[PDB]
Amino acid sequence: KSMESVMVKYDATVRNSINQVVQLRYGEDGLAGESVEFQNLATLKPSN
Amino acid sequence: NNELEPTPGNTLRQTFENQVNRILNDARDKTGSSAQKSLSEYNNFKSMVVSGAKGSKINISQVIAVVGQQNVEGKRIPFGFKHRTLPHFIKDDYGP
Amino acid sequence: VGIRFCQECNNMLYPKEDKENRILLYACRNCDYQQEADNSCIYVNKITHEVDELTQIIADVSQDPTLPRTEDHPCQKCGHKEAVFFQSHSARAEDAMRLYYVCTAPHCGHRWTE
Amino acid sequence: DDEEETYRLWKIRKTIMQLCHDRGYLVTQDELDQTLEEFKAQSGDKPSEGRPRRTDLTVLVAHNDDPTDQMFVFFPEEPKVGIKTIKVYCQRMQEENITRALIVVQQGMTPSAKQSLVDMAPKYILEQFLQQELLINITEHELVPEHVVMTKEEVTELLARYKLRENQLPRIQAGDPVARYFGIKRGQVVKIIRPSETAGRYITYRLVQ
Amino acid sequence: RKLRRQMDIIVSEVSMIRDIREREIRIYTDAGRICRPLLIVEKQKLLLKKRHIDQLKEREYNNYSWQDLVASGVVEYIDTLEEETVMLAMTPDDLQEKEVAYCSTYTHCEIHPSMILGVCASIIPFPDHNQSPRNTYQSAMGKQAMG
Amino acid sequence: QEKMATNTVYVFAKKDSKYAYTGECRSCLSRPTSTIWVSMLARQRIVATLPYIKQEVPIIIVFRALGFVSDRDILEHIIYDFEDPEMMEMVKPSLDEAFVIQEQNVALNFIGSRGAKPGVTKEKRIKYAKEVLQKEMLPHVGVSDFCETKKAYFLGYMVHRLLLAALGRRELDDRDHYGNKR
Amino acid sequence: KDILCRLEHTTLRKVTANTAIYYDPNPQSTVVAEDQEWVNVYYEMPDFDVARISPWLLRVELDRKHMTDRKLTMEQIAEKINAGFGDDLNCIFNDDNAEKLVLRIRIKMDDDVFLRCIESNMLTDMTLQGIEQISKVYMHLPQTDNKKKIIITEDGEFKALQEWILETDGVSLMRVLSEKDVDPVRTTSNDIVEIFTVLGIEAVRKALERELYHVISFDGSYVNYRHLALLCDTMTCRGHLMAITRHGVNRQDTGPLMKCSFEETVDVLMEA
Amino acid sequence: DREVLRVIFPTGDSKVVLPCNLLRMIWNAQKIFHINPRLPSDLHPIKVVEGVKELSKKLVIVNGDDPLSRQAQENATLLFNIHLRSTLCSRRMAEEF
Ligand SMILES: [Zn+2]
Ligand SMILES: [Zn+2]
């Protein structure tokens, strides 16, 4: 009931029913949560 | 004989219960590991657990070795009677 | 220490100070009757409760058939082998597992702790 | 006694210097970075019946754009501040023709003096700061992301780019501790830059209401 | 206790409890109290003997029954809060005999440990080899079994 | 139908309630159930919630209304051993709270003032409280006016059990103990 | 351990063995046996036995175990009592040599009644050490990398260090952040409203996100970040903590038909 | 990019959720085109850098030519671009893939 109206608009912005901006891009990256997978950066951990 | 030293931050009852629970959990885990090691390659319990279809290593341990400690509200079985669990046991009996 | 009662009316004594004289006395307000006090303490408060329970526990618990009993610890005065043991009941102490012992014989009311 | 009060005063002064630097006021590197021993030597160690009385501590700093716009920071002598004391500060403020100032209250302020503060708002703006709030810089906490006060031109560009009316933005209330730290007005828009574990970085815009 | 066991002027309905530490003695003739029969143990020996079993095995055409067993002082009714003062032995042949003794002051003995189950749970074969939730499911489903 | 047992004193402890300990005795002579409560207030003093009476009443006022003027007799019914100072220290504030009432008729008027109404006259006010204390207070102990002494003992036992609960000398009664049920 | 003792709330009751009120009319002719041996030291050149001094004596005993566990000083206790109450009590106290650790206190309300009230105030409220609303403080070395300090070495590697951390029962975040040698950057609490009132709204956003992630992933399950982020953003969008209840959701400026379908059906339409 | 990652990810947790699985994709390419790791490669190292640079322009989350839009696009695709550059390193391409 609290979230029922939150929705991705055609601006790719996330707005509620009053058009108030909740997120400027969905998920802060604009990607759907079903096509993503786990991966390794491979640059973070190594020694210099 | 009041020889048990209370762990910092924890009451004497808390550390006594912790030690007994530690001992019993170690026993149950050792017995379960032994039972799992004793399983043959033809055992259907192992064939079901290894493939992950249904059941688990604790299920095998309880079936073969030891059902284990029984807990009420995350604690060992309380004293519903005055100072004992059932009328068959003696008062002030903290044994397993 | 604790309550004392007036003789004239069986009511509480409570303390008053002899203003002209600097001696404490007990005076029951329901009458004139007075007592210069023996108790130079009027109020004491055992905040830490370090007290052992030997006075609260009593010899008749020796007759409880559901209590455990061992021959290991002998009584001091008679040395009868049988002695029933049980745990503390004080809610509020630095310890919670010490055993209170009572001599089991019908004619030796004697008690100890370990 | 006296050493602890000195330590508290040194922390408060350092936090106030960081405050002024973050607000865009000309603060020299030495004033930003002052060792405890240096502050102790400058202001004379023990405060109680000693050289750092509270009135010894007041700060005048100049803005980078214009040196005419100057901030005083006051450190009241009294555990609680009254209308009389605030009127004395305002009289001095008018005599020095300055427009902005802070007050560092040791315990708290009477509501009548708070109302006196807001009554002055179109003329002279005074901001209350409790002593404990200035004992640590909340901006350096790990939970607080980067805050940047936007100019009116930047706000206009933002609203033209996203075609947003001002009320459609996320909001931040004026009583927010970060909004108190940056001295942010009703109607201004803040820019928050925080790291994200999906994108890497994310910018949020809050309207101050 | 002697009068209750002799049924003389105290009905076996009546429960008597002595709380030694609190120095109280409570007697209940009240209705609604749940109770169960138990065998009396005197010293380390049951009061139930081979002659009682012989007479009960010849129960037919002997007018000797459970009421005659009660009147002999062999079995006793005990309710919930009298059990607090009762030392129960799970079985006679395995807790009355001398060992490195757990207890020697046993006062009562269960008839059979399987008497703790209800009507629907008494049809379960090997109920001690199962998980308790499954026993509950069977107890619930037995009321729906057709016959 | 399962229900709590009657005529037996129980002691419990509520979390948020103004009382640290609440002793009660659901009493039945075969009739609707006349529950007295005897409670100990938190930050300590003892008050009673009598049936058909508006508000709490101090214990000493009730005891004096029962006909026991003297503090010795009241504490002798409450405390069975005068050699224990902790019990005296626990009871003392309750005595001090009800000092302003010293006469039995004054106590009866005090109780009647908190009745279902104050009666029309001093005699009807005092009469209503006497009827409530003889008919509605502890009916299983007795109903004939001689039994007030026995009623006093039972009330003293209730208070004594509450004091025992307050001293930690006894364990609080378990409500799900199936022997406490009928 | 020093920080632990400085952080934990300790009342005078915890270190007090027992208390007794005596009648001790004259300074020198005391009721007690040992106090003659310091009463003489105090009254042979009497400190302020200049006005009259009251017949009623208050006498608190202090357990040595608790006294030395918390690194207390009887001089510290006397200073704190005298400062908290002013000059309206005279404090007489022993050197640590005395085996029986005594703090002899002397003063409309009657003398003993006021002195009993003093005792009942001191035991409960004296607040000897630490920060109140802090019941207990636990100290331990974390085994989990999320509580272990992880730093970058000179080779650019990630090295995990073990340092002592404290976990309190009860929350007062501001004064703990004020405390000497407490790390202000990383010190955090699990309370959301306390973080609000201390650090602001973005801090609540992040802390609420962390709490939700912890409570969801403690079971071992995994939930995508986007849903947690959306929940936190919706709760913190309007600038204050919008609880997901009838109050927080129906105080949004939405249509009355949306509100009547959640938890306040008739009242919403009546007000609209 | 390594410094940025070390700022973004303390504790050094390298597991990240990203759209397309580059290692699996490279392995797919290796198997589709029958690539022999035992033989020298014909891939010019300039083309690796140029292809990465041109691909990074075609992954648009925020569409626009304003500086604000450019900054938004960079913040949106920073992590994925860093990962893409790390995996499509010219040396890593020449040695492993
Ligand atoms: Zn008298
Ligand atoms: Zn003996």
PDB file of N, CA and C in Angstrom, chain D residues 113-146:
ATOM      1  N   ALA D 113      14.256  34.260  23.638  1.00  0.00           N
ATOM      2  CA  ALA D 113      15.439  34.644  22.877  1.00  0.00           C
ATOM      3  C   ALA D 113      15.473  33.994  21.498  1.00  0.00           C
ATOM      4  N   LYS D 114      15.014  32.750  21.379  1.00  0.00           N
ATOM      5  CA  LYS D 114      14.834  32.145  20.060  1.00  0.00           C
ATOM      6  C   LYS D 114      13.888  32.978  19.197  1.00  0.00           C
ATOM      7  N   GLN D 115      12.745  33.365  19.764  1.00  0.00           N
ATOM      8  CA  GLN D 115      11.820  34.230  19.040  1.00  0.00           C
ATOM      9  C   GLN D 115      12.462  35.570  18.707  1.00  0.00           C
ATOM     10  N   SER D 116      13.288  36.107  19.609  1.00  0.00           N
ATOM     11  CA  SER D 116      14.021  37.326  19.274  1.00  0.00           C
ATOM     12  C   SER D 116      14.945  37.104  18.081  1.00  0.00           C
ATOM     13  N   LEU D 117      15.592  35.934  18.025  1.00  0.00           N
ATOM     14  CA  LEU D 117      16.458  35.595  16.896  1.00  0.00           C
ATOM     15  C   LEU D 117      15.697  35.620  15.582  1.00  0.00           C
ATOM     16  N   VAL D 118      14.542  34.955  15.545  1.00  0.00           N
ATOM     17  CA  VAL D 118      13.803  34.897  14.284  1.00  0.00           C
ATOM     18  C   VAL D 118      13.160  36.243  13.958  1.00  0.00           C
ATOM     19  N   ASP D 119      12.786  37.018  14.977  1.00  0.00           N
ATOM     20  CA  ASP D 119      12.249  38.358  14.748  1.00  0.00           C
ATOM     21  C   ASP D 119      13.208  39.231  13.943  1.00  0.00           C
ATOM     22  N   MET D 120      14.512  39.115  14.205  1.00  0.00           N
ATOM     23  CA  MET D 120      15.522  39.890  13.487  1.00  0.00           C
ATOM     24  C   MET D 120      15.745  39.440  12.048  1.00  0.00           C
ATOM     25  N   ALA D 121      15.186  38.302  11.639  1.00  0.00           N
ATOM     26  CA  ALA D 121      15.664  37.594  10.451  1.00  0.00           C
ATOM     27  C   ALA D 121      15.845  38.449   9.196  1.00  0.00           C
ATOM     28  N   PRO D 122      14.949  39.379   8.836  1.00  0.00           N
ATOM     29  CA  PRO D 122      15.222  40.195   7.640  1.00  0.00           C
ATOM     30  C   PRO D 122      16.396  41.149   7.796  1.00  0.00           C
ATOM     31  N   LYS D 123      16.706  41.584   9.016  1.00  0.00           N
ATOM     32  CA  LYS D 123      17.792  42.532   9.247  1.00  0.00           C
ATOM     33  C   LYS D 123      19.121  41.803   9.423  1.00  0.00           C
ATOM     34  N   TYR D 124      19.221  41.026  10.498  1.00  0.00           N
ATOM     35  CA  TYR D 124      20.432  40.345  10.948  1.00  0.00           C
ATOM     36  C   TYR D 124      20.060  38.898  11.243  1.00  0.00           C
ATOM     37  N   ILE D 125      20.865  37.941  10.790  1.00  0.00           N
ATOM     38  CA  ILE D 125      20.534  36.534  10.958  1.00  0.00           C
ATOM     39  C   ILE D 125      21.518  35.911  11.933  1.00  0.00           C
ATOM     40  N   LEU D 126      20.972  35.336  12.997  1.00  0.00           N
ATOM     41  CA  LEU D 126      21.725  34.717  14.074  1.00  0.00           C
ATOM     42  C   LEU D 126      21.356  33.244  14.117  1.00  0.00           C
ATOM     43  N   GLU D 127      22.344  32.383  14.326  1.00  0.00           N
ATOM     44  CA  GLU D 127      22.101  30.949  14.322  1.00  0.00           C
ATOM     45  C   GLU D 127      22.597  30.362  15.630  1.00  0.00           C
ATOM     46  N   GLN D 128      21.731  29.611  16.303  1.00  0.00           N
ATOM     47  CA  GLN D 128      22.099  28.971  17.555  1.00  0.00           C
ATOM     48  C   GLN D 128      22.819  27.658  17.279  1.00  0.00           C
ATOM     49  N   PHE D 129      23.873  27.401  18.049  1.00  0.00           N
ATOM     50  CA  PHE D 129      24.601  26.141  17.979  1.00  0.00           C
ATOM     51  C   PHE D 129      24.909  25.681  19.392  1.00  0.00           C
ATOM     52  N   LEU D 130      24.464  24.477  19.733  1.00  0.00           N
ATOM     53  CA  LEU D 130      24.775  23.927  21.040  1.00  0.00           C
ATOM     54  C   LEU D 130      26.241  23.511  21.099  1.00  0.00           C
ATOM     55  N   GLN D 131      26.772  23.484  22.321  1.00  0.00           N
ATOM     56  CA  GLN D 131      28.182  23.164  22.513  1.00  0.00           C
ATOM     57  C   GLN D 131      28.504  21.742  22.067  1.00  0.00           C
ATOM     58  N   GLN D 132      27.631  20.785  22.384  1.00  0.00           N
ATOM     59  CA  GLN D 132      27.900  19.397  22.017  1.00  0.00           C
ATOM     60  C   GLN D 132      27.851  19.191  20.508  1.00  0.00           C
ATOM     61  N   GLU D 133      26.951  19.894  19.815  1.00  0.00           N
ATOM     62  CA  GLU D 133      26.856  19.743  18.366  1.00  0.00           C
ATOM     63  C   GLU D 133      28.154  20.124  17.668  1.00  0.00           C
ATOM     64  N   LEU D 134      28.918  21.046  18.244  1.00  0.00           N
ATOM     65  CA  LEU D 134      30.183  21.480  17.669  1.00  0.00           C
ATOM     66  C   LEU D 134      31.382  20.724  18.226  1.00  0.00           C
ATOM     67  N   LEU D 135      31.169  19.780  19.144  1.00  0.00           N
ATOM     68  CA  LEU D 135      32.278  18.992  19.663  1.00  0.00           C
ATOM     69  C   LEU D 135      32.793  17.969  18.663  1.00  0.00           C
ATOM     70  N   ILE D 136      32.072  17.734  17.568  1.00  0.00           N
ATOM     71  CA  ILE D 136      32.518  16.814  16.530  1.00  0.00           C
ATOM     72  C   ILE D 136      31.988  17.310  15.192  1.00  0.00           C
ATOM     73  N   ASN D 137      32.764  17.073  14.139  1.00  0.00           N
ATOM     74  CA  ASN D 137      32.380  17.452  12.782  1.00  0.00           C
ATOM     75  C   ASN D 137      31.633  16.281  12.158  1.00  0.00           C
ATOM     76  N   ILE D 138      30.306  16.401  12.083  1.00  0.00           N
ATOM     77  CA  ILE D 138      29.484  15.331  11.533  1.00  0.00           C
ATOM     78  C   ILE D 138      29.736  15.126  10.047  1.00  0.00           C
ATOM     79  N   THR D 139      30.249  16.141   9.348  1.00  0.00           N
ATOM     80  CA  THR D 139      30.530  16.000   7.923  1.00  0.00           C
ATOM     81  C   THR D 139      31.599  14.949   7.650  1.00  0.00           C
ATOM     82  N   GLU D 140      32.463  14.667   8.621  1.00  0.00           N
ATOM     83  CA  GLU D 140      33.524  13.687   8.446  1.00  0.00           C
ATOM     84  C   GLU D 140      33.098  12.280   8.844  1.00  0.00           C
ATOM     85  N   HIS D 141      31.843  12.093   9.243  1.00  0.00           N
ATOM     86  CA  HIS D 141      31.335  10.761   9.535  1.00  0.00           C
ATOM     87  C   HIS D 141      31.180   9.966   8.244  1.00  0.00           C
ATOM     88  N   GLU D 142      31.245   8.638   8.369  1.00  0.00           N
ATOM     89  CA  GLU D 142      31.173   7.781   7.191  1.00  0.00           C
ATOM     90  C   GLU D 142      29.778   7.777   6.577  1.00  0.00           C
ATOM     91  N   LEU D 143      28.742   7.964   7.395  1.00  0.00           N
ATOM     92  CA  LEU D 143      27.373   7.908   6.893  1.00  0.00           C
ATOM     93  C   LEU D 143      27.003   9.151   6.093  1.00  0.00           C
ATOM     94  N   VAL D 144      27.601  10.295   6.408  1.00  0.00           N
ATOM     95  CA  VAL D 144      27.254  11.553   5.749  1.00  0.00           C
ATOM     96  C   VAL D 144      27.986  11.671   4.417  1.00  0.00           C
ATOM     97  N   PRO D 145      27.263  11.771   3.311  1.00  0.00           N
ATOM     98  CA  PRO D 145      27.883  11.978   1.999  1.00  0.00           C
ATOM     99  C   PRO D 145      28.260  13.444   1.803  1.00  0.00           C
ATOM    100  N   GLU D 146      28.795  13.746   0.619  1.00  0.00           N
ATOM    101  CA  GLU D 146      29.230  15.107   0.328  1.00  0.00           C
ATOM    102  C   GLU D 146      28.046  16.018   0.022  1.00  0.00           C
TER     103      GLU D 146
END
